[PDB]
Amino acid sequence: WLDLYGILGENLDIQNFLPLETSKFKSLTSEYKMITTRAFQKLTIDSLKMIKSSLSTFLERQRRQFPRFYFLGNDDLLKIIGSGKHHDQVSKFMKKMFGSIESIIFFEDSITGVRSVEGEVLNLNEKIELKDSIQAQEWLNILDTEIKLSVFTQFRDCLGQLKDGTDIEVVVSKYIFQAILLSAQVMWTELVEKCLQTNEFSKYWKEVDMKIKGLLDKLNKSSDNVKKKIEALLVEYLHFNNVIGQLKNCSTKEEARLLWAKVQKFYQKNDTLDDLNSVFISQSGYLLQYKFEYIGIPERLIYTPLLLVGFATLTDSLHQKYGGCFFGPAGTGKTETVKAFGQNLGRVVVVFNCDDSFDYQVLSRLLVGITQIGAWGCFDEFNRLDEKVLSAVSANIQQIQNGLQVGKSHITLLEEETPLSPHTAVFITLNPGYNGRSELPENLKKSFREFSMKSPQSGTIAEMILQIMGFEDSKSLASKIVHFLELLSSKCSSMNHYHFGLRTLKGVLRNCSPLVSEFGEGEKTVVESLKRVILPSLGDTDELVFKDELSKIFDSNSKAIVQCLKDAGQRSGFSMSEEFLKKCMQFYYMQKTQQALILVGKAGCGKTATWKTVIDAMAIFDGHANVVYVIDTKVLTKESLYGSMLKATLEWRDGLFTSILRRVNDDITGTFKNSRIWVVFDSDLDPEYVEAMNSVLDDNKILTLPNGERLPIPPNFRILFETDNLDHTTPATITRCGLLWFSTDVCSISSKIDHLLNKSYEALELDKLKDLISDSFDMASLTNIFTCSNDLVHILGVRTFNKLETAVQLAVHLISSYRQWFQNLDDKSLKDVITLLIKRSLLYALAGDSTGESQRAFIQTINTYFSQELSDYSTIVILSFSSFCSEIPSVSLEAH
Amino acid sequence: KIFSMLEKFGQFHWFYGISIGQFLSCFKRVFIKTRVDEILWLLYQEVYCQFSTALDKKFKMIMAMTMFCLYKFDIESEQYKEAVLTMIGVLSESSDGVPKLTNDDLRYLWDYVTTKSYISALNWFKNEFFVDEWNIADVVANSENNYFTMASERDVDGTFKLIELAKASKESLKIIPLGSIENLNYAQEEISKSKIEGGWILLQNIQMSLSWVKTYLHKHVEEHEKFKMFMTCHLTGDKLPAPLLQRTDRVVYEDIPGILDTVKDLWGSQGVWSVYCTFLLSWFHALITARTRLVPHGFSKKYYFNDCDFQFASVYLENVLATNSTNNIPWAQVRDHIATIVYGGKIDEEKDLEVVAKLCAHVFCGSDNLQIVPGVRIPQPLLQQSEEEERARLTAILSNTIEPADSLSSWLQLPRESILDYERLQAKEVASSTEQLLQE
Ligand SMILES: Nc1ncnc2c1ncn2[C@@H]1O[C@H](COP(=O)(O)OP(=O)(O)OP(=O)(O)O)[C@@H](O)[C@H]1O
Ligand SMILES: Nc1ncnc2c1ncn2[C@@H]1O[C@H](COP(=O)(O)OP(=O)(O)O)[C@@H](O)[C@H]1O
Ligand SMILES: [Mg+2]
C-alpha cells in the first residue's frame, strides 16, 4: 500500500494516465484505510495482486523514462518510485543499476557524492538540489551526468597536476582511482611516444622503476583505501615498465613501432569542446571513446600478452560495432578480460549468466534494456542457451549491430520502438566442447568475432601478484609455483576432477594473502597456501605425490579451532579420529577464503557430519549465529529452484534459492547482518541446475535473473555442494569451487556403532541398560562378524558401514519395548535376552537382504562368533525363548 | 535412366530427392532454350546445370562422372566403355589395368590418373562434357517457382550470398530466423504482406521449427511476380518434409573447390595501394581456405574462414593505408594483425598459429617482386597509375594464371604424399559410389 500510495496515491497529475487504474487504486486505498482504522480502534492482498496487472505498462513506461530501471524488479521499482520524500530507498539499488556504487551520500536534502562498493568516496562537482516535487528519474539522470562530469573533472585535475611535474605518490592521496589511472596512462603514452621519437629508453625505464619502487614502499604505510589504490596503480605501472623494457630491448625501429602499435594507447583530444568525448583509446590503429563512467577501485588484472591480444581483438570487433566473442576451456580469463576491457574503457560491463530459462522474450528484453542504457553487455556462457533461442535472437542482435553501425536513432524489438544509445555493445563468453551445451548457428556466429584463449600465462600473473604482495623473491617463487602445478597435473592420476589451471593458482594467491601476518612473506606462506588449497581435493596416492614433489621443488597453532571442533563433536557424539579431524581442518581452512565448496565421497562417508560440526565450531569460535538452508537440487525443478516467468501476465515468480537470496539481501528484521548463511545442495550436481549459478560462484558473486534482476552475493553467504560422483559435472563448475575429496570413511566401525548407540539413547535404570547393552557388544568378535558378512550375496548392494544404523535402531527399540518385563529376572537371564535380541537385529540388518540359505549361514556364523544361541526360527514370547511352530493359529477358511 | 539415378541419390540423402514435375520442367526448358542427339545433349547439359546445385561436391563429381559415362557409353563403342571402366576401377582401386589405346582426351585422362592427380581425374569429366554451371543467382534467375530451399552443413552459412543477390536485384530481404512463436507469427504476417505487395523474404534455420514447417509452410506452398521466398536448412539436421522440399527449388551452398576460382570470385566481389592490398588479401584468403580442408596435414583441425574475416581484414588494411599516408606501410604490423587477430582468433593450436603466420609472412612480405605462387608474380604498384588501371592490371595478371594439376601441394607448400593420400581417398570414394551406381 505504501508503494501504491507513492506511485499514484500521493503524487499529483499522475492519476490522469490510467483512469481505471486510478479508480481501482482509490478504492483499494479506501479499503486499506478502513482496515487500518478498524485495526487501530488475504482479500486485500488478492485485490493488490489483481491491480498489479494494470501497473505493468506504467512500470514499463517508467523504465523507458530511466533506462537503468531495467535491472530492477517490479517490487523494487515500486519501492524506488513510491519513496519520493525519504530519498534513501534509491541508494539501496545503486549497485543493481550502476554496479560500482553502493549508496549515495546525502547531506541536508542534497546529494554531495556517491560511494563505491569497496568504500571509495567520489565527491560531485555540484550538489544536486532535491525537492519533494521532483521524482526519481529526473534527478537520477542528472546524478548520472554529474557522476560522469565529476570523474572527468578529477581526471583533468590529476592530469594537470602530473603535467606540472609532481610525483604520483602525492597525487594518489587526492583523487579517485579512475582519475589517477587514466591520467597516468595518458602521461605514460605521451612520454613513451616522446621516447620513441628518439631512440633512448633507459632513462624513462629507470624513472618508471623508481616510481614502482616508491609506490611499493608507500604501500606499507597506507590505509586500506590507499593500499588498494596503490596496488592497482602498481599493476598499471608494472605494465608500463614491461612495455618500456620490451621497447628498449627491440633491435630496430620498425619492430619497436609494431610493438607500440600492438598495445593500448590512451590519447586525449586537445580541441574538442565536449568534455566527456575528449579522451579516446587507441590500439592496432583503431580508436574507442572513453565514457568516464564511475568504476571505483576494482580488482585490476595483470597485463599478460594474452590479455593484450584479447583487448586488440575486442577493439577490432567493436570498431565495426560487432560483438566480441571469447571461447576456450574453463578458468582462462574470458569474462575477466571483458570486464578489464570495459574498465580500461571507463564503463562497468554488465554480465549476464545465460540459461535455458532465457527464452526469446527474456533475451530480447535484456537486449532492449542494455541498448537503451548504452551499457556494455556480456552474455556469459552463451552455449547454455537453447539453440532455438540462439537462432531466434540472431535477428535482434543483427538489428542492434546494424543500428549501431548506421547510427539509427531507434530499433524495434519486442514489438516496441525504443531508443538505441550509441555507447552499447554486446559480448559473449562461451565454452565450446562441453556436454549439455548447445551449438551456436553460423548466422549467429558471423555476428560475433571469436578469439581463442586456450592457454593463459600463469607465470606472469603469479610473479606480478606476488611482487605486489611484497615478496622479496618473486620471479623464482612464481616459477616454482607454476612448475609445481605443472608437475602436479602431469604426475598424478588422470581422473576427471583434477584441474590445476589459472583458477587454483588465483585461489593459492588469495589464500596466501592473509596469513603473511604470522607466517611472513616468504616460502613457508606459499607452501602453506598450496597445501590448504590443493591437498583437500587430492586422493590417497596423489597426496603422497603432492608431498614428494612439494619437498622436491620447495625446500621449506590453530589450537582454538581444534578445541571448538572437539567440543562440537562431543556435543554431537562424533569421534575425533585422525581422518575426521583432518577433513575438518581442510574444510575450515579452505572455507576461510573460498566461498563455494563441494564435498565429494562415497555415500555415508561423512560429508554432512563434517560440514555440520565445522559450522557449529565456527559459531562457537566467532560467536556468530549460523543459518543453514539445505536444498535437494534435483528434487525440485529448475523453474521451481530459480524461478519462472508467468506467460499469462509477463510477471516474475521467485524460486527457492532466489527467495532465500532475496530474503537475506532485503534484511527486513535486521538479524542477518552478523550471521553466516549456508545453502547446501544435497543432491546430484546437474550441469543444467548448477551452471545457472556460474556468475554466483565466481568473482562476479551475482545472480542474473531472466527478468534483469541482479542479486549480489554477500560475503557471508556461502554455498555448499554435497554429492557422491562428479561424472557428469563440467570443469566450469569444478574449478569455481574449492573441492574437499573424501577418500575413505571418516569414522571407524566401532566409533560409528557408538555414535548410533548414544544417539539412540539420547532419543529416548537407563544407565544400567546402556552399560549392559554395551557389555553385550564385543568389538573383537563384531569386526570378524562384519568381515564375514561381506562374503554373502546381497541384492541392492549396501556397504556394511551403512547397515550399522538399522542394527542399532532395531536393538535399541527391542530393548525399549521389552523394558516392561526387565525388572523381574536375574542378570544372566537379562544378558542372554539382550544378547539374543542384538543377534537377531544383526542378522536381519546384515543378512536380512539375502536369501534364506544365506540367512541360515549368517545365523550359524553369528552363533559361532558370539551367549544365548539364536536359531532360524527363534523367538521371544510373553519372556521365554521359543520357536515359530507354537505360534501358528488354526485357519479354516470358508467357501466364500 | 537419369530419373532412376536421381532417385538413387534421393535414397542416399533426404535433401537429394527428385520429383517428376521438376524433371519435366527441365525437359521443357531444354526446348525453351543429326538432331535427336542434339536434344539428348541439351537435356544432359540442362539436367546437370539444374540439379548439380542441389548436390554437394562429392555428389556433384559423382553425378557428372555418371552422366558422362552414360552419354559416352551410349554414343561411343565398347572398347571406349571398357577403357573408361578400367580407368574408373583403377581410380576405385578395384580393377588395376591399363586401358586399350585407340582418342585424344583418353590420353589426357590417362595422364591425369597415372601422375596420381586424382582431383584432376575427377574433374576431367566436368571439364570435358559439361560446359556450363549455375550459382545461386542463376538458380533464382532461371526458376518459375517462387519458393527456394538452400542447404549447407553446419558452421557455414550462405545468407550473405542471398543478401548480395537481393542487393544486385534491387529487392528487399526480410530475414526472419525461426525458432520462436513470435518469429513464426511475424513470418506469417510478412509472408501475407509480401504475397500481396511484393519483396523477398528469407527464413533462417527452418529445421528448428519443424512443426510449423510441417503445417503452415506445407499448406502455404501447397496452394505477385516480385515475391520470392528463401529457406535455409542444415544437411546434417533433422529431416524436412518431402512434399515441401519437392515443391521448392533446392540449392546446396558450399565453398568453391578451386584456388584460382576462389581468387577470381573474391576479386569480382569487390588508391592503387588499397587495390593491391585487396588483391593480396583475396589471394591469402583463398590459399588459407584451400589449406583448411586438409584436416590432418594442412592444419590440426577443421576451421571455418568466411566472408566476415575477409571483411575485417580488408577494413583493417584500408584503415592502415588511411592513417599511414607517408607510404611507409607497416607490413609487419599488417602481418601480425592478420595472423593473430583477424584470421588467428579461431586458431586454437599454436602450430596452426605458426603455419598461418608463415602464410601471412609469405603473402604480406611487402616485397617489390613477390611470388605468391610458383607460377604468378605480383609486382608492387607504381606511383603513376590510377585505381582503374591497377584494377585492370591485377585482373589481367589473374587471368593469365593457370592452376596446375598438383596445385594442392605446390601452391600450399605441403609434402606431396599427404596430398596423394587425400586425393586417393576422395577419388576412391567417388569412383566406388559411381561403380555401385552404374551397375544397376
Ligand atoms: N566422526 C564420526 N563419528 C561418529 N559417527 C560418524 C562420524 N562421521 C560420520 N559418522 C556416521 O556416519 C553416518 C553417515 O554419515 P553422514 O550423515 O555424514 O553421511 P553423508 O556424507 O551425508 O552421506 P550421503 O551422501 O549418503 O547422504 C552418520 O549417520 C554417523 O552416524
Ligand atoms: N591477467 C589475468 N587474466 C585472466 N584471469 C586473471 C588475471 N589475473 C587474475 N585472474 C583471475 O583468474 C580467474 C579466471 O577466471 P575467468 O577465466 O575470467 O572466468 P571464465 O572461465 O568465466 O572466463 C579470475 O577469477 C581472475 O580473478
Ligand atoms: Mg565465464
- Cell 537486449 identifies what position? A367
Residues of A within 8 A of B183 (CB-CB) are 360, 392, 395
Which among B332, B291, B285 is positioned nearest to B311, based on CA atoms? B285
CA atoms within 13 A on the CB side of A180: 26
* A752 vs B: CB within 8 A: no
From residue A496, alpha-carbon distances to A454, A726, A820, B46 in Å are 18, 8, 57, 58
Q: What is the separation of C-alpha B206 from the centre of its chain, rounded to a whole number of angstroms?
A: 22
From residue B162, alpha-carbon distances to A577, B135, B232, B253 in Å are 73, 11, 10, 11
Residue A575 CA: which ligand 1 atom is closest?
3
List, in sequence order, every residue forming a beta bridge with A704; answer none if it has no partner. Answer: A710
Q: Apex CA A105: angle with CA A104 and CA A108, to 5°?
A: 125
Q: Is A154 helix (H, G, I), strand (E, B) or coil?
A: helix
Which among B209, B308, B337 is the nearest to A284, CB-wise?
B337
Spatial separation of the C-alpha atoms in residues A104 and A772, rounded to whole Å: 70
Show the cell assigned to A656.
Answer: 527457492
**A328 marked among binding-site residues:** yes
Cβ atoms A303, A320 nearer than 8 A: no
How close B139 gets to chain A, by Cα (Å)? 22
Q: Do B175 and A452 touch (CB under 8 A)?
A: no
Show the cell assigned to B267.
Answer: 576479386
Show the cell assigned to B390.
Answer: 591497377
Q: Tell the burial category of A299 from Cβ atoms under 10 Å away from its Cβ (0-12, 13-18, 19+).
A: middle
Gaps in chain A after residue (C–N beyond 2.5 Å): 41, 556, 764, 866, 878
Spatial separation of the C-alpha atoms in residues B241 and B252, rounded to whole Å: 17
Residues of A within 8 A of B233 (CB-CB) are none
Return phi, psi of residue A682, to 5°: -95, 70
From residue A276, alpha-carbon distances to A152, A425, A638, B163, B373 in Å are 7, 19, 44, 38, 51
Spatial separation of the C-alpha atoms in residues A338 and B279, rounded to whole Å: 34
Q: Do A257 and B204 touch (CB under 8 A)?
A: no
Which among B157, B346, B347 is the nearest to A446, CB-wise?
B157
Collect all residues from B whose CB is shorter than 8 A from any CB in A: 154-157, 159-160, 175-180, 182-183, 204-205, 208-209, 232, 304, 306-308, 312, 315-316, 319-320, 323, 330, 332-333, 336-337, 340-342, 345-348, 350
Helix (H) or strand (E) holding A690: helix A687-690
Q: Tell the burial category of A300 from Cβ atoms under 10 Å away from its Cβ (0-12, 13-18, 19+).
A: buried
Residue A599 CA: which ligand 1 atom is closest?
21
Spatial separation of the C-alpha atoms in residues A433 and A449, rounded to whole Å: 18
* A209 vs B: CB within 8 A: no
How close A196 gets to chain B, by Cα (Å)? 16
* A392 vs B: CB within 8 A: yes
**A305 marked among binding-site residues:** no
* A88 vs B: CB within 8 A: no
Cβ atoms B64, B125 nearer than 8 A: yes
Spatial separation of the C-alpha atoms in residues B163 and B160, rounded to whole Å: 5
Spatial separation of the C-alpha atoms in residues A317 and A617, rounded to whole Å: 53
- Cell 560422483 identifies what position? A725
- Cell 545465460 identifies what position? A354
Which among B304, B320, B345 is the nearest to A449, CB-wise?
B345
Q: Is A845 helix (H, G, I), strand (E, B) or coil?
A: helix
SS (H, E, C) chain B: CHHHHHHHHHHHCHHHCCCHHHHHHHHHHHHHCCCHHHHHHHHHHHHHHHHCCCCCHHHHHHHHHHHHHHHHHHHCCHHHHHHHHHHHHHHHCCCCCCCCCCCCHHHHHHHHHHCCCHHHHHHHHHHHCCCCCCCHHHHHHCCCCCEEEEEECCCCCCHHHHHHHHHHCCCCCCEEECCCHHHHHHHHHHHHHHHHCCEEEEEECHHHCHHHHHHHHHHHHHCCCCEEEEEEEECCCCCCCHHHHHCCEEEECCCCCCCHHHHHHHHHCCCHHHHHHHHHHHHHHHHHHHHHCCCCCCCCCCCCCCHHHHHHHHHHHHHHHHHCCCCCCCHHHHHHHHHHHHCCCCCCCHHHHHHHHHHHHHHCCCCCEECCCCCCCEECCCCCCCHHHHHHHHHHHHHCCCCCCCCCCCCCCCCHHHHHHHHHHHHHHHHHHHHHHHCC
Spatial separation of the C-alpha atoms in residues B355 and B357, rounded to whole Å: 5
Q: Do A285 and B160 touch (CB under 8 A)?
A: no
Cβ atoms A310, A340 nearer than 8 A: no
Q: Do B182 and A392 touch (CB under 8 A)?
A: yes
- Cell 583477424 identifies what position? B342
Q: Which residues line ligand 2 (CB under 6 A)?
A: A 301-302, 304, 307, 330-336, 429, 456, 461, 502-503, 506, 698-699
- Looking only at Cα atoms, what is the longest distance across chain B? 70
Spatial separation of the C-alpha atoms in residues B274 and B266, rounded to whole Å: 15
Q: Do A446 and B342 touch (CB under 8 A)?
A: no
Spatial separation of the C-alpha atoms in residues A369 and A365, rounded to whole Å: 6
Q: Is A216 helix (H, G, I), strand (E, B) or coil?
A: helix
Number of CB atoms found within 10 A of residue A167's CB: 12
For strands A101-106 and A110-116, give the pairing: antiparallel
Contacts of A274 (CB under 8 A, 6+ apart): none
Residue A699 CA: which ligand 2 atom is closest?
25
* A149 vs B: CB within 8 A: no
For the four alpha carbons of A108, A113, A118 and A120, in that order, the dihedral sign comes to negative
Give the residue whose CA is nearest to atom 19 of ligand 2. A331
* A416 vs B: CB within 8 A: no
Q: Do B308 and A446 touch (CB under 8 A)?
A: yes
Cβ atoms A667, A316 nearer than 8 A: no
Show the cell assigned to B108.
Answer: 589426357
Q: Do A391 and B330 touch (CB under 8 A)?
A: no
Q: What are the strands, taking DSSP E only, across A332-433? A: 349-353, 376-380, 410-412, 417-419, 425-430
Return phi, psi of residue A654, to 5°: -70, 155
Radius of gyration (Cα) for chain A, nearest Å?
34
Residue to substitute in A607, A748, A757 for testing ligand 1 pocket (most ligand atoms within 8 angstroms of CB): A607
Reported residue count of chain B is 440
Kindly report each contact of residues A411-418 with a partner whose C-beta sits within 8 Å and lies 24 or more positions away, as own/partner: A411/A371, A413/A364, A413/A367, A413/A368, A414/A361, A414/A364, A414/A365, A414/A368, A416/A368, A418/A64, A418/A368, A418/A371, A418/A372
Q: How many CB pairs under 8 A join A and B?
A: 109
What one-letter code names the amino acid at A447? S
For the four alpha carbons of A70, A71, A73 and A79, in that order, the dihedral sign comes to negative
Return phi, psi of residue B298, to 5°: -65, -45
* A442 vs B: CB within 8 A: yes
Spatial separation of the C-alpha atoms in residues A192 and A247, rounded to whole Å: 9
Residues of A within 8 A of B156 (CB-CB) are 442
Render A96-145 in DSSP notation, one character per residue: HHTSSEEEEEE-SSEEEEEEETTS-EEEEEEEEE--SSS-HHHHHHHHHH
Show the cell assigned to B436.
Answer: 555401385
Residue to substitute in A567, A571, A574 for testing ligand 1 pocket (most ligand atoms within 8 angstroms of CB): A574
Resolution (A): 3.0
Spatial separation of the C-alpha atoms in residues B61 and B380, rounded to whole Å: 39
Which among A313, A320, A446 is the nearest to B315, CB-wise?
A320
Ligand 1 neighbourhood includes A365 CB (under 6 angstroms)? no
* A647 vs B: CB within 8 A: no
From residue B2, alpha-carbon distances to B5, B71, B78, B129 in Å are 5, 11, 21, 16
For strands B227-234 and B249-252, give the pairing: unpaired
CA atoms within 13 A on the CB side of A806: 17
For the four alpha carbons of A722, A723, A728 and A731, in that order, the dihedral sign comes to positive
Show the cell assigned to A629.
Answer: 538452508
